[PDB]
Amino acid sequence: SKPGCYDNGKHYQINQQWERTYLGNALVCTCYGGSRGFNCESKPEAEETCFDKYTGNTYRVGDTYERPKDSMIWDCTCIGAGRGRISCTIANR
């Protein structure tokens, strides 16, 4: 039994922050203890906005917007966050 935070082959102390990588991309990490653990995250850069490479409009992350494409309707969601994860899944109903 012993607390601490082992990452990147280093021995940091709880409540400590360090820089890592998720597979192969920037990814910071913050220790919360031996029980809470740590939650990594990519170099923050203001999360709350889109672009819509399709046309290039402005949409928030807290709002959905359908997008008619082809003979199939989908409900695209401005799931930017990290950058742009606009998920478009067929209508629920």
Side-chain angles (χ1 to χ4, degrees), residues 45-50 59-62 81:
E45 192 192 333
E47 142 175 14
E48 256 168 79
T49 19
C50 313
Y59 313 135
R60 216 172 116 190
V61 63

Side-chain angles (χ1 to χ4, degrees), residues 57-69:
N57 252 122
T58 334
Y59 313 135
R60 216 172 116 190
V61 63
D63 216 285
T64 62
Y65 64 101
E66 291 115 53
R67 244 262 62 81
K69 232 195 207 273

Side-chain angles (χ1 to χ4, degrees), residues 31-53:
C31 190
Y32 298 64
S35 229
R36 309 177 127 192
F38 62 72
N39 256 359
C40 261
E41 355 170 356
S42 275
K43 238 296 193 298
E45 192 192 333
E47 142 175 14
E48 256 168 79
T49 19
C50 313
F51 186 61
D52 218 17
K53 35 173 259 122

Side-chain angles (χ1 to χ4, degrees), residues 13-91:
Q13 236 175 247
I14 310 93
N15 276 277
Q16 179 147 35
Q17 272 204 266
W18 58 98
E19 181 221 54
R20 235 157 104 67
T21 208
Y22 203 137
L23 228 71
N25 295 135
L27 189 72
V28 164
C29 241
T30 301
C31 190
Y32 298 64
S35 229
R36 309 177 127 192
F38 62 72
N39 256 359
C40 261
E41 355 170 356
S42 275
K43 238 296 193 298
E45 192 192 333
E47 142 175 14
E48 256 168 79
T49 19
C50 313
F51 186 61
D52 218 17
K53 35 173 259 122
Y54 282 13
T55 309
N57 252 122
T58 334
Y59 313 135
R60 216 172 116 190
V61 63
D63 216 285
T64 62
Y65 64 101
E66 291 115 53
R67 244 262 62 81
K69 232 195 207 273
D70 222 47
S71 156
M72 181 73 105
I73 324 117
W74 321 64
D75 251 42
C76 298
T77 301
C78 243
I79 316 211
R83 173 197 214 164
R85 228 179 171 73
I86 317 116
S87 180
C88 307
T89 187
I90 299 96

